[PDB]
């Protein structure tokens, strides 16, 4: 199943991006006066609300590499959601042409 | 219909998450000085703008369990939207191969 390979890998990729992104955000934001994304617990929640595109604004990067990490977290969460949605649609379609009599 | 089972259950799940999430957010935010997500009416609107990923930033949790509840509200609204979109696509596809002559 190709659609389950792409969705399954993207979700694994997303988890790696969320954890590494939380780590790399703190590493890139510290050293910049005024930054508030400087502790791992709340940086872990920031990566989730970034990947899900919620983006409250309570937490955000101010540096270049912090923003580059943010972009990666944005793209990873969006593409993973696009692949899973696509994989679900083909799963339902193939399931629907079955149950009738089409294999 | 499997795609209507998954979309129909997800929307029901979303309503449960929205109501319980509004309740659990207030319960988890009270006791934390500075929290503003501490009354049920506006916490009910916060769960909607969280599940829809709008996230104005007028309201957001500051505690651990408040943020954990927020994550659940984020994921519930996103996956429900992914299943309904998938269910619509298969519904249109099956409707399109009909009307021609394919059953």
């Amino acid at each position, epitope marked *: 199943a190709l659609h389950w390979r792409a969705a399954g890998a993207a979700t694994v990729l997303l988890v790696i991006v969320l954890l590494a992104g939380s*780590y790399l955000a*703190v*590493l890139a*934001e*510290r*050293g*910049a*006066p*005024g*930054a*508030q994304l*400087i*502790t*791992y*617990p709340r940086a872990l929640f920031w990566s989730v609300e970034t990947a899900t595109t919620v983006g409250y604004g309570d937490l955000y990067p101010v540096t270049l590499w912090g923003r580059l990490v943010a972009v990666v977290v944005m793209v990873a969460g969006i593409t993973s959601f696009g692949l899973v949605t696509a994989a679900l649609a083909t799963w339902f379609v193939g399931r629907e042409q079955e149950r009738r009599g089409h294999f | 219909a499997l795609h209507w089972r998954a979309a129909g259950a997800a929307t029901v799940l979303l309503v449960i998450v929205l109501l319980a999430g509004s309740y659990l957010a207030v319960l988890a935010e009270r006791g*934390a*000085p*500075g929290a503003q997500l501490i009354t049920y009416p506006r916490a009910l609107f916060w769960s909607v703008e969280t599940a829809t990923t709008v996230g104005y930033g007028d309201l957001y949790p*500051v505690t651990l369990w408040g943020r954990l509840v927020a994550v659940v509200v984020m994921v519930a609204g996103i996956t429900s939207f992914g299943l309904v979109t998938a269910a619509l696509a298969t519904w249109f596809v099956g409707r399109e191969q009909e009307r021609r002559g394919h059953f």
Partner: antibody
Framework: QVQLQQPGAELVKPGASVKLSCKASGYTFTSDWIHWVKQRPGHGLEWIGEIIPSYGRANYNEKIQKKATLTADKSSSTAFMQLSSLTSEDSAVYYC???????????WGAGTTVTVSS | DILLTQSPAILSVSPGERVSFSCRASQSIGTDIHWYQQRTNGSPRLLIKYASESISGIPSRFSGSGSGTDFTLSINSVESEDIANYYCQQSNRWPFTFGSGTKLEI
């Protein structure tokens, strides 16, 4: 079981340098930050800089003059601070502290009494 | 940066009396304040992390409160071992800063 072990004291000639150490026992996570705090006799706590040994990146106090250079050795779990070009104004007690990346200094060292005199 | 002002410099109190130190920040820092104790010729010791939450090993005698720009460390019934220097530290913004300190005398 001192988690952060520092030498007792260090004597430095005016204008010379010294390499302070901070051997770390206990749990050593990849999210650990080692902070260095300067304290003059009869004075308060002053933040010098931080370093994450798992990555090797260090930050410093911009409001003061850069006298320190932070390094680390993951194989021996020991962070180092290089105080160069010392005057009498650099004579103080230098602590090292371990932060779990959650903001607070959970464990401190005994401090090293650095004296700059001829 | 964020300056932390501690008042008063020296705090006199009778034994068995509830005392309170004050830590105030230049700007709103939520609850990201931490309290430390330093006795004579000793190293700082964490008493309170994140304004109000306690630390294992530290007596229930110590308690903290406040949010925004006004923080308070309280001691129910001060005894002789409480005589030390008390500091507050913020972690809300980079860089971490310390308070000027408050000495306790009985």
């Amino acid at each position: 079981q001192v988690q952060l072990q520092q030498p007792g004291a260090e004597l430095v000639k005016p204008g010379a340098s010294v390499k302070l150490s901070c051997k770390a026992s206990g749990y050593t996570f990849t999210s650990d930050w080692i902070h260095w705090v300067k304290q003059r006799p009869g004075h308060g706590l002053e933040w010098i800089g931080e370093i994450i040994p798992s990555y090797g990146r260090a930050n410093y106090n911009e409001k003061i003059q850069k006298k320190a250079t932070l390094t680390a050795d993951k194989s021996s779990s020991t962070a180092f601070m290089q105080l160069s070009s010392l005057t009498s104004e650099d004579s103080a007690v230098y602590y090292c502290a371990r932060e779990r990346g959650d903001g607070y200094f959970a464990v401190w060292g005994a401090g090293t009494t650095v004296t700059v005199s001829s | 940066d964020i300056l932390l002002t501690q008042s008063p410099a020296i705090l006199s109190v009778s034994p068995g009396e509830r005392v309170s130190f004050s830590c105030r920040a230049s700007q709103s820092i939520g609850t990201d304040i931490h309290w430390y104790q330093q006795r004579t010729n000793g190293s700082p010791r964490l008493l309170i992390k994140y304004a109000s939450e306690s630390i294992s090993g530290i007596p229930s005698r110590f308690s903290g409160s406040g949010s925004g720009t006004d923080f308070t460390l309280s001691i129910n019934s001060v005894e002789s071992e409480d005589i030390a220097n008390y500091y507050c530290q913020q972690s809300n913004r980079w860089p971490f800063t310390f308070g000027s300190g408050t000495k306790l005398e009985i």
